Every structure is written in structure tokens, then in C-alpha cells.
Amino acid sequence: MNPIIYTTLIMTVMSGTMLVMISSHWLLIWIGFEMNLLAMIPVLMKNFNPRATEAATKYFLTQATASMMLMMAIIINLLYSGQWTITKMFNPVAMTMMTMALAMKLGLSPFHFWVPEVTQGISLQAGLLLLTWQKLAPLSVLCQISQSINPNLMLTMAMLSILIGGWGGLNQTQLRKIMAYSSIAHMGWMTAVLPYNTTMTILNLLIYITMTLAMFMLLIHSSATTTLSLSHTWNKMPVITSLMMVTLLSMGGLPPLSGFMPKWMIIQEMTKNESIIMPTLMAMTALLNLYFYMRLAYSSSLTMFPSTNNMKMKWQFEHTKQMKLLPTMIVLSTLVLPMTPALSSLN
Amino acid sequence: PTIRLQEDPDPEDENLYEKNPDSHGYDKDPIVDLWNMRVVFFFGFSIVLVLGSTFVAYLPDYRMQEWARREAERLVKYREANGLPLMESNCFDPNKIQLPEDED
Amino acid sequence: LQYGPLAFVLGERTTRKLTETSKVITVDGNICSGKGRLAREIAEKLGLRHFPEAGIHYADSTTGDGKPLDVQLSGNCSLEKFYDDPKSNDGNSYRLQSWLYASRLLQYADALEHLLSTGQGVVLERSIYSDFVFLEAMYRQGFIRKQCVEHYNEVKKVTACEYLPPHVVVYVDVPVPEIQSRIQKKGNPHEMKITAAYLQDIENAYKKTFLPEMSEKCEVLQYSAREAEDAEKVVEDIEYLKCDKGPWPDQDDRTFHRLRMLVQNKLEVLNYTTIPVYLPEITIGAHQSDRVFQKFTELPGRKYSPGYNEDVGDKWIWLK
Amino acid sequence: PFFDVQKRLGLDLDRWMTIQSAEQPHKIPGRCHAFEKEWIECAHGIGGIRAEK
Amino acid sequence: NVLQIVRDHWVHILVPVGFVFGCYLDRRSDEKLTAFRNKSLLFKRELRPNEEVTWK
Amino acid sequence: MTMMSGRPGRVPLQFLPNEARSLPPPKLTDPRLVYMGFLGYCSGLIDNAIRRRPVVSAGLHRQLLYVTSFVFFGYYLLKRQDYMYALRDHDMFAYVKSHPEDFPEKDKKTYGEILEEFHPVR
Amino acid sequence: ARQWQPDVEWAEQFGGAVMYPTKETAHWKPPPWNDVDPPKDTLV
Amino acid sequence: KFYIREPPHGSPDWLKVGLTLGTSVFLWIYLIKQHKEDVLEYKRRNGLE
Amino acid sequence: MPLVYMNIIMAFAIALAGLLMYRSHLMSSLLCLEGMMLSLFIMSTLIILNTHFTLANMMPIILLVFAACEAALGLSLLVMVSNTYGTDYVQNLNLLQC
Amino acid sequence: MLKIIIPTTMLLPMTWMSKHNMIWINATVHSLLISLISLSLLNQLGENSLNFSLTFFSDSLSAPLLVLTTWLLPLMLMASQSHLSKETTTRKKLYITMLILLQLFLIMTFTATELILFYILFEATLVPTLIIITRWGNQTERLNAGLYFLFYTLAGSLPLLVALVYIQNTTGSLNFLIIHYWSHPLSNSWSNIFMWLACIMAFMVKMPLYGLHLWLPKAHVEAPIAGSMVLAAVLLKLGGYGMMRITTILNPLTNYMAYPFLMLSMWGMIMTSSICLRQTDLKSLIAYSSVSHMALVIVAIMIQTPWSFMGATALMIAHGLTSSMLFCLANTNYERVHSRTMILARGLQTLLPLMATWWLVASLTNLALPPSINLIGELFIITASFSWSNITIILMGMNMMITALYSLYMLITTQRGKYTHHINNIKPSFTRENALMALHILPLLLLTLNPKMILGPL
């Protein structure tokens, strides 16, 4: 692919997301989604091979079905109230269809199956984009229509997402599928607090995006897509594996690391309403994500796996391309808890 | 090769007394070893142990044991002089307490 | 400025620097044949850059200072003990073969990077496309196992497919008895133990796999022993080749851009040489790996990045 | 979520088409122009929670 | 010759300096909790002809 | 739920309303600013470590820029956070003042008139 | 005399396409080293 | 000592170093000035001095 | 609502059910997607004409435009799938699992 | 109390800027100086606590714990430098960094004024311990041990967190002084019962309570020597400190919510003491000893009397010192013979007499010989339990008989009998090991000389 064409496609993806974020008209929001998908399909196919083509096809089918349901919900809402402005969604059937369409776009359970497959079928850069930038538009719409949400449906989907993310991640040796299941669980956490406080949703999204960016950038720096290939990195660059171990611990939600901050905050918010059983269940379930993060840390940093002879040659060369934002991303992923009250600036 | 992998053999353990018959067991470098021994002994026994015990032994009476004993002595003297009971079953004056009006 | 998407966007294009004499050349041949002299003569006459055959310490000559390192920290294999004890139960044979393939891949990447950066041609002795013959001669003699051949084929499959095969393949044919006579006249006590079956296996692999499969990508110039000393005739035979059949004419600016991004970044070149396949011949335990890596990091110019080693005379570090 | 770029810049990117009581071509009126106008004027400025009642 | 000695043993002032800085910060923290100084019913006292505050 | 998005008078993308100028600015020795500078210094050290450069001495200009950028952003972040908390307090106090029926101050009782159950420990 | 570290037998536990293999997934293969499946000879 | 150019030479990149130092100094001066004006405006609005 | 509205809604539901239930051909599912787009066009046009929302009359045309884009996207992908397998069966898209 | 916190944070860069062959000396010297500074916290009042600021305070319960932590750091450093000689400089500095971070987290945990800050630090102690265990442990089981150490803790502490935030929504504060002054009784409802369980189970699993103790033998056996020292001496006392803090809001529910835990503690104390009688690994015996002593501490905290609280404080301090000393004593033999089997090396009194004296004194303090503070705590708890119910003297009595038995058993197995003939590599004791034993044991008897410093706020 031409670099000019790649830049144009990335800019079109971002423009579709921005159009979703700045629009007041439902038609313009739908157009933003369409433009984002149209530009996103070729980016997933940048390195051409059958797996990338399969991932792109599955992604297109899922997102096109979601957009059809989105448009039908908009039209039903218009039928029962001649309104185009994104507001309290005057019809409940239309609101149910809207919620299901947005959940399918986000990959929330039980519309979760496509996320591990698409993530595994594409490159690490495409996976970074898909798991970070592609969450902004549906979450922005959900934040805008939160007051009309049905808490039962969204809470059911969020709890299912957390459970399924943990259970599915428990079974993986491929790093991209691990990241996808982690994303599913974190989306569940984000949507669990949405009917109560959208500021907490934004805070969780920001912290998750920072940690995911650090994770994907560390995985690109050490060209590993499997557990066994990541188990070699200690014999080439131990600093990368140590930073990865601390980042995994933060993603597990352990204090005093930054990944503990959202869950903590969310739990507190849920106890400001009554909502006692659900946060307890959510934390006990997030223990599963912590377990498979810890297994990855065992494989890559806390023990030393056997290496190969040809690795000696790799000792003689340095990394050519350097990521300028990786150190700041790591620091923000780990040492940010003491600045928790700054979340007031989010609302 | 009838082998599984290329590995170093497990090495024998080093005796610190071989190269240093008076070795103190702190370091293989004799001078660093001797000074580690010296600093451990000086700052562990001479400074923290003895001086800390002396400091704790002479800590001033912030627990107010002697003050309480003297106050009790004055109270007992006064109460025995005036024939009052040494202690009262009530520690709060009933005139400052308002019981509920009705018990039925 | 480092070559990248920005350089390609404005200005830099590879297709313009090709001036009809790019012509990646390789000069293959059996053991002790005079292919190196012929390659040097070809490079001198045509004005191309000559690459001597990649040995155990080829990577050493391109990083740090060009001096070779200790065999323990680089290679971890011996050609002399391969000749002495080819059936050693310590895995020396396939370890040497795998390290040599990695070295050849690095040299091919260097040559391609030079050609794509300057437009000047290159002349190589052997390549990644020709290394396999030795592996075959190793397997037919029982020197390595079948699992080693499977691992070698996997690595070659995932590595050699990303580059362009050479424009013209030059072969020097020498009979096995003549090779034995040359080896005896040489005097190296390690090469006198080469049995004729090994050389015959190398020749069979060449003439039955390499030349037939290379002739489909481009025409192959074969020369006997006597008609290789006359290098000017070989050069003027090269100068009249109609090279319009292989993948090289099917290259445009974007494919060249991708290839140029690949040939630099030697880590990406060597990515798949260390795949987690645990053959006992090439697998190294954690304790030995840690000890050897600690030993390597203590070399005088290796602890930090090239410009940041003040123990080899790097100044102004605290502003770099 | 919603960055009110239109409000900040005063651009009117899509607000012209949100409601049926807003400046149609040739002054063609919607079938329910008066009802929507009355509802909008009732609900203006008091928030969704109060307007719903 | 004190250059080598200093560059070898300058790490021995970090902990005493930290102790002094911690003492200073504790005094600063005490400075921010004087809202009831000489105001409790148990310890309220008339000032001496010279002293300004009852405690620092 | 969104508490403060529809608060009347809010300019969409301001980040710092003019009213916030009536609040005392954070001191330049604020411990939160010191921690932000510490985060910048840690970022510089990690940058040195990843690039295989001497961690503490490699780039002093780069480390200085890291610390300066973190402090510069942290100052305005702290200003906005303090403004938001001041706004919350202002609205809470105004609402309590305007709805006295929902916030009554009931008569005070001393502990000599309050009957508390005693639970012996035995 | 020295700390235990993982060997080849330990490392092979993570080399499969999945953890906790079953009868159904014992035939799942790990993806190719580069994400390129061999081309089928689907001649038209 | 190095066999290759090692584009970062013994002398540092003076343009980049100057740009970095200038950016840091300008940011510090801007921050000091902004804090001074903020203190002045707060004092004026609340009428302390 | 009139009977026509219910009929159009039923058509949309039928097309959605047809899309969600794959048989073998990807082309049939793409046809179901196009049918859903057509049903949405008809429903929106009927609503906009009934209420005399003059400026909304351009909205259905916009829908059609993006429908075409979506239709083109799908076809492009189908081409690649066919070039890999010689067929457009959804059974062949099984290299990636959960 | 930043005058203690800041010097540890300064230990961090002092270690990372030290010369390669001076890390142990500098760390030990400045750790001992920090312990000497922390000695001043023992000046406590009779009425309230030392309220340093809005964030930190010192009581008569937390000051001896802080002193024990700061004193344990140099001993851990002394015990670790033998088996880390072959390590690289960077990894040694990382190990020392883990120890320093653990000390900092413990120091801030014992003095936090709010319960959520206490929770955050009390969970933050997990990371350095897990890293130490799983990176510097010797055998392959360490990995499993780490997992057992982690989830057992977190499965207890995640409910507590929820309860904590719930409480802050009900009373408006988690400050311990406000919580104590504004205390209100807990009614008898299912919601209150589950709040009680959420507030109690994390500390119960930290002690650990019998039945929830399986993580402890694994973690304390597979850990390196410093890890075992800090796990037995300080990290087990987090549960007791947290329980004594949290019980102020649980009355009068405790009056009947303590019965299952009291039964578990008494019977499991008998059970773990019995388990110590048939143990082939010397470290596992010491771990099960810790379990029995902590069961005693749990009983003392649950019956909620001034005498039981004083006994619990004294027992925690005494057990910390004694168990750390016993782990070091076992580690000397392990480093000599590279095996933890108790019957492998026998008759060591003939080869190492002074080490045999250290063994005798440690085992004497384990069985609570009077007038050691071990015995003082045990006797106070037994007297309080007798007041609670006269029948407890049976179970407690049985425990006193079993403990001594296994204690002396350990001694008789290792020091007496005849030496093993084929073991010829038993070198004379180093000055470092003797100094370590002395620096463990002398503070115990010195504390016996003045027992009111470890008797707590009651």
C-alpha cells in the first residue's frame, strides 16, 4: 500500500469517528459509522494473506448488520416522534434495538465472537487500532443516550462480557486473542457503570486505552505474537520484559498500580446507588484476567525459558524504529494512582 | 545426540575459607568482608542495641503512671478524711442524666 | 534522514537509480573451486561491489568494529571440528549449518540494501538460494537428522520468500577428482578428511536441484574449470544477456519501497531464524544463555548503543 | 462523547434538519408544525427530566 | 585527592538528608493544624508577658 | 448519568472558564506538581533504558524536556480540577439554601438524654 | 546447587494452539510462523 | 572504532539540542509568567491586596 | 400504524432473519443486506412523505448512497474470498477460532 | 512521621547509585540507622494516639510493629547476601529494591489514618512479596506457591473493599478516629451478617485461619530466606492489626459471629500442632508452628477483652522474632547440605556447638519458657479464654503439651544423636550467621526486661 493512501485511510477512519462525536443529527452519526467502517476495512487488509481477508470479511459482516439495526432503530424513533436529534430516545423498542446494535459494534457479550477472530487474523498495528480507536464512537453514543438506557439489559451484557472475557482468556496461548478477551472484559466494566455515571466510563476507557497502547507497543517492539516467542525476549532485551511484567500487573488491577483506579472508582459509584452484589461479582470475576496475566508474566519475565543459538546474532543489532510515546505510555499505565482526584476534570 | 539441550553443568559450591581462612562469611573480597563485619557489629550492637535500650529505659513518663498514683493518693486521703466512700458505683452525676419519663 | 514513508512520499524513488547494470550476480560452485577469484574479477570488470562469502563471523565484521568475536559469543560452531568429527553427538553440524544460513541471509539483506540505496550492482559467492546443497550433503551422509532438515526447510520457507532471486547465476563446474587433487595440494589438515561422497553429494544437489530450479527464474551461465580463468570472456558473456523473464522486471516503486524497508532493520530480517522450535542441536539452556549473554554485554563496545560507549572513546554522551 | 463544535463555532452543520418546524424551503409547513412548536417552546431551557412531566 | 573519595562515598548523605527533610516537612505539617492552639478547655492559658504562641 | 454537561452557561470546549480566575492558583511547590515532575523524570529514565543508553546520564536535555512538559500540563490539570470541585461545592450549597424543607436542622439532644442500649462483653 | 529454570519439557506446555487440550481441539494446529497459510491448488 | 558511520557522531546534534533546551526554557518562563498573572488576578478579584 | 407500515417492518425483519441464517453462499447474505437497505429506504420515505417533512426528503437518497458503498465493499471482499478458494462458501472462512 | 518514610525512599537511590561492591554495606548501615530513628515512636501516651497529621498516626499497637519492620530489614539483608553472591549487580539491586519497597509499604500501612489508604497499602505489599518468591525461589514449586499466595489473599480482600466503600456511603467517613468516636451498634440482620463477614474474612485469610491456611506452607517453604523472614514476622501480623482496628464497628454482632472462627481456631491449633509432630521438611514444621500461634492470636482478638488484646500484641511481636530466627537457623543447614529433609543432617551439636546453643534458645522461646514475652502473651490469652469459658483450658492445655514436644523433637532430630557419616562438607559457622542469630535473640530478652512496650494500647 502507498503511504499516501494509508494516511488518507487512517484520516478517514478518524474523521468518521469525529463525525460521530460532534454530530447532533442521527443521520450524521450513522454516516460517521459508515465512513469509519468503509475506511477501516482496507486497513485490516494491509498485509494481504488469507487470514487477514477472513478477518476483514467477518468484521464487515458484523458491522454492517449492526449498522442496519442502528438505522432501523433511528427510523422507528422518528416514526414515534418526528425527532432527529440524539436525545432521550422516545421509543423503548427502538431503544432496545439501538442498545443491541451498539453492543454488537462494541463486541460486548453475547455479540463477542468476532473480536478474538478479527484480532488474531490481523497484524499488531491493526489490532492496536481496532482495540483502541474503534471503541470511541459507540461509547460516545451510549454516553449521550444513557438516561434512556434499560439498566437490566446493559448490566446483563456487561456481566456476561466480564465472565466471558475471563473464561475465554484463560484458554489462550496466542497473544492477540489474549488481548481481545481482555478487551471484552474491560468493555464489560466500562458498560456496567454507564447508566450511573458516564464520567467513570470515560475514566475507565482512558486508562484501558493507555494500558492497551503500552501493551501493543511493547509487543510490536519485541516481535512476538505467541507465548513461546515472547519467552525468548529476556535473552535479547530484559528491560522490555520487566516493563511488560509491571504493565501486566497493572492491567490485572493490583494496587498501587494505575489499573486499580477505574475498578475502585466504579465499585464506589455502584455503592452510591444500592448495587452491592454486582460489583462484588465483577471483582471476583476480574480475578480470572489477573490469573492469565500472571501466567504470561511467569512465562516472559519471572522465569527464564530456553533460547536458541541464532539469538546470538540478534545480540549484535539494535532496534531501528523507535516508538516515541512508549515510555510515557508505560509511566501512565503504572504510576498514576496518586493523581486519582484529577478525574474531576473529566466531567 | 541422545541429549535434549545445550546446558552448563551444575557447578560446585565455593568455600569462602579456601581463599580466606579468616573470612567472616560476608564477601569474597577480604577487605570488603572485614569492613562489612565491622559496620554490622558497630551499628547493630554498639549503636542500636545498647544505646537504643538505654534510650527506651529512660523514656519520660508520658503514660502518666506516677501522676495517676499521686492523684489516687490525694483522692484516697481526702475521702478517708471526710468519711466518704472510697469509690462510687456511678461515674456520672445523676443530676445531669434525664431518664425516660415512663417505664410502663 | 532515515529512509521511510516520509522519504518515499517526497522525492526518493528506487526505479530511477537502476541504470541497466544493477544485476545482482552470484557465482556458485563446489568446494575448492575458484569461484571467489571469478567473482572478484567480475566485480572489478563490471564495477560492482564484491561480497566475500559469508563465514561464521560475517555479522561481526558489520557491527561494532569489524573484528571477529570469540566463537563462544558468536557462532558457537566450528567448521574444523565438523571436518574432524562430522557425527559428533553435540550437534555441531546442524548448528553450523543453521548459523551459516543466518549469516547468508544477513549478507543478502546487506547486498540488497546497498543495491537499492545506491543503484550499484553486487557480486556474491553463495546465497540463501544455494546454501541448501550443503544441508543435503549433510543429510545423505548421516551427519544430521531429518528433524534438522525439517527445521531448516521451515526457516527457509519463512525467510527466503521475501527477497528477489539474483539476476544472473554463474556456476563453475569442477569434477570431484580434480577437487580432491586441489584439496590435497592446498595443505589444510582439516580438509583432507573430506570424503569424495560428500563432494559428490554437493555436486548432485547442485546439478539436480539448484541449477534446474534457478534456470526458470533466469538463465544460468555455466563454465568449466578451464573457461573460468578467462574472466573477460565471462564478463562479455554476461554483458549480452536478455534479462526480461524473471520477477525483476515485475517490480515498481511500491514493491521496491517495501523491499527497501525490509532490507534495512536487520532485526526484521533475522526475526524468523530464532523460531521456538526446540531441536537439541540448537536449543540452549537458560543458565548457559544467561551466562553467555552476560559475557557478551561486557565486551568493550557492546553494553550500550553504538554512540554511547564512553569506554571506547565516545564523547558528549550527556547531550546525545 | 459529544463535543459541541457547532455550538462553540456557531457553524450549523446539521441543526437545520433536526426538526420539522425549522425553515423549510418555500415556507412549506409540516403537517404538525404548530404542535411541535408548542412542545418545543414548553420544554425549552428546563431540562429533559422536568420537560418529561 | 578528595575527588575520588567524594565520588565513591557521596551516597552516604542521602539518608541523613532525607531524615532532615522529613523533620522539616513534619514541622510544616504541624504548622497547618493550629486552629485550636491555646483554645481547648483543658489547656487554655493566659499568655506570658513575652511569649507569642503556646507551641509551634 | 452526566452531572455537569448541561449546567447552564457552560461553554462547550473551554477547559477553563473565566469564573475560574477567581480561585487561588496552585502553588508551584504543590506536591501534586512535584509528583507530575517525578512522572516526567521516570518517563525520561525509561526512555533511556529502552533505547539502550546510560539510564541516568544519557540525555539531560531530553530529561529536562520530559520534566518540564509534565509539570506544564499538570499545572493546568490541577487548575481545572480545583475549579470543578469549587463548582460542585457552590452548586451543593446553593441547592441546600434554596430547599430548606429538604434539609431541616432538628433539635439537638445531649448524651445525658439519649438512651443507648448497652451490650456487655463477656 | 542452582535455581530451577524451565526446560524444553516445561516450555512445550505453552506451544500448542490452546491450553487445556481436549479430544476436539487436540487436532487444532498453531498458526504458521508468519500469518501466511500455504496456497491451495483450487484450479479453476 | 565503529566499522560504520554511526550517524550520531562524537559531537551531539546541535540543532536538536538547542531546540529542546529552548522549548524547555520557554515553557518554564511561560509557566512562571502565567502563575504570576493568575495570582494577581485572584488577588484583584477577591480584593486581598 | 396502518397495515403498510407493519408490512414494511415485517419485510425488514424477514431480511434480517435471512442475513442471520447463512446457508452456503456469501452472495445470498449480501442480497439480504441489500434487501434490508431497501426496506429502510421505503419505511423512511413513507414516514417523511406522510408528515410533510420537506427537508427530510433528501435523507433517503443519502441512505442509498451509503448502501451502494456497503454493497461495493461486500462485493470486493467476495472477490478475494473466491480467489482464495474457487468458491464463495462461508464454510471456508474458518481459519480463525475463538 | 515523614522522618522515617523519607529515609527509606532515600535508601532506594542510594542503593541504585552505590558502587557494585558496596551495596550490602550501605544498605545495612542505613537500615540500622532508620531502625534507630524509628525507636523514638515507643514514647506513647495513656489516653490517645500520636496524631502526626491528617494522614498518619501512631498508636501503642502500631509502634512496636513499625520497630519490628525496621529492625527486620537489616537482618534480611544480612541473611540474603550469602546465596546471592553469584547474582549480577543489577539483579542484586533489584532484590534490595523489592525489600525496601516492602518496608515502605508496611511502614505506611501501619500508620494510615483512613481505612481505604490502609487497604491500598495492605494490598500493595503483595507485589514485592510475589516477585521475590517467584523470581528468587529455588525450586519449581515456587510458581504454584506464588499463585496460592496471591488469590487466597485477593479472594478475601475484594469483598472487604466493597464493604469499605459501602461504609463510607453510610457514615460519611473512614477516618479511624471518627469511626471510633461515632460508633453505632450493628443490628441482627442478614445484611449486617454479610457486612461482618466482608469486614472479617480478608484479615482471617491473612492470619491465616485454620482451613484457609494452605497457601502458607507453600509460600513460606518455597520462598528465599528473606521472603520467609518477612512473611512470618510481619506480613502475618497485618491480619491481626486489621482485625483489632476493624472490630470497633462490629459490636454486638461479634458476640455470636465469632463462634465458628473460635471453634476453628482452637481445634485447628490442636491440629497444626499435631501436624508438626510428623513433618519431614524442616521449613514446613516452622510454618505450621506459625499457624498454631496465629490461631491463638485469632482467639484473643475474637473474645474482645483488654487482657486478650494485650496478649495478642505481645504474642505477635514475640512470634515474629522467634519464627524469623527459626527460619534463619534452618537456612544455615540448608545452605550447608542443600536439602530441607530434617533427618538428613543429624548430630550437628558435635560439629557446630554455638549454632546448637542458638537452636536451643530459639526452641526454648518457641515453647514459651517463662518469663519470655512468648509466655506472657500466651498466658494472657489463656487467662482471658478461661474467663470466656472454663472449658477452654482443656484445648489450650493440650496445645501447651504438643508445642514443646514438637519443638524439642526438632532440636533432638538436628543437634543430637550421631552425625551422618557421608556428609563431610559441614564448614564452621561464619561470623555473619552468629551475628544474625544474636541480633534476633537479644532483643527478645531485652523486651522481656520491659514488657509494657509490646502490650498495646489496652
Ligand SMILES: CCCCCCCCCCCCCCCCCC(=O)OC[C@H](COP(=O)([O-])OCC(O)COP(=O)([O-])OC[C@@H](COC(=O)CCCCCCCCCCCCCCCCC)OC(=O)CCCCCCCCCCCCCCCCC)OC(=O)CCCCCCCCCCCCCCCCC
Ligand atoms: C512509592 C514511593 C516512591 C516509589 C516510586 C516508584 C518506583 C521508582 C520509580 C520507577 C521508575 C524509575 C526508574 C525507571 C527506569 C529504570 C529502568 C532500568 O532498567 O533501570 C536500569 C538502571 C541501571 O542501568 P545502567 O546504569 O545504565 O547500567 C546497568 C545496565 O543497564 C544493566 O541493565 P540490563 O537491562 O542489562 O539488566 C536487566 C534487568 C533490567 O531490568 C530492570 O532494570 C527493571 C526496571 C523496570 C522499571 C520499572 C517498571 C516501570 C515503573 C513501575 C514501578 C511500579 C512501582 C509500584 C510497586 C509495584 C512494583 C512493580 O532485568 C533483569 O535483570 C530481570 C530481573 C527480574 C525482576 C523483575 C522485577 C521488575 C519490576 C520491579 C520494579 C520496581 C520499581 C523500580 C526498581 C528500580 C529500577 C532501576 O537503573 C538505574 O540506575 C536508574 C535508577 C536510579 C536513578 C534515580 C536516582 C536519582 C538521582 C540520585 C539522587 C536522588 C535525588 C533525591 C533528592 C535529594 C537530593 C540529595
Ligand SMILES: CCCCCCCCCCCCCCCCC[C@@H](O)O[C@H](CO[C@H](O)CCCCCCCCCCCCCCC)COP(=O)(O)OCC[N+](C)(C)C
Ligand atoms: C555472652 C555472656 C552472657 C552472660 C554474661 C552477662 C554479664 C552480665 C550482663 C547481664 C545483665 C543482667 C540483666 C539484669 C537487669 C538489669 C537492668 C534493668 O534494671 O534495667 C531495666 C531497663 O531495661 C530496658 O528498659 C529494656 C530494654 C529495651 C528493649 C529495646 C531493644 C532495642 C531495639 C532493638 C530492635 C527492636 C526489635 C524488637 C521490636 C519490638 C529496668 O527498667 P525500669 O524498671 O523501667 O527502670 C526504672 C528506672 N528508670 C526508668 C529510671 C530507668
Ligand SMILES: CCCCCCCCCCCCCCCCC[C@@H](O)O[C@H](CO[C@H](O)CCCCCCCCCCCCCCC)COP(=O)(O)OCC[N+](C)(C)C
Ligand atoms: C492512564 C492516564 C490517563 C491519561 C490520559 C491522557 C493524558 C494526556 C492527554 C492531554 C489532554 C489534552 C486536552 C487539553 C486541550 C483542551 C481541550 C478542552 O477544551 O477539552 C475540555 C475537556 O477537558 C478534558 O476532558 C480534560 C482532559 C484531562 C484528562 C485527565 C484526567 C485523568 C483522570 C486522573 C488520572 C491522573 C492523570 C495524570 C495526567 C498525567 C472541554 O470539555 P467538554 O467539551 O465540555 O467535554 C466534552 C465531553 N463531555 C461533555 C461529555 C464531558
Ligand SMILES: CCCCCCCCCCCCCCCCC[C@@H](O)O[C@H](CO[C@H](O)CCCCCCCCCCCCCCC)COP(=O)(O)OCC[N+](C)(C)C
Ligand atoms: C474452611 C473455613 C472457611 C472460613 C469459615 C467462615 C465461617 C462462616 C460461618 C457463618 C457463621 C454464621 C452465619 C449466620 C449466623 C446464623 C446462621 C444460621 O444457621 O443461624 C440460624 C439461621 O436460621 C436458619 O439456619 C436459616 C439459614 C439457613 C441457610 C444458610 C446456609 C447454611 C448451610 C451450610 C453451607 C456452608 C456455608 C460455608 C461454605 C464454605 C439462626 O436463626 P435466625 O434467628 O432465623 O437467623 C438470624 C438472622 N436473622 C435474625 C436476621 C433472622
Ligand SMILES: Nc1ncnc2c1ncn2[C@@H]1O[C@H](COP(=O)(O)OP(=O)(O)O)[C@@H](O)[C@H]1O
Ligand atoms: N554452507 C557450508 N557448510 C559447510 N561448509 C561450508 C559452507 N560454506 C562454505 N563452507 C566451507 O568453506 C571452505 C572453503 O569454502 P569455498 O568457497 O568452497 O573455497 P574458496 O575459499 O577457495 O572459495 C570449505 O572447507 C567449505 O566446506
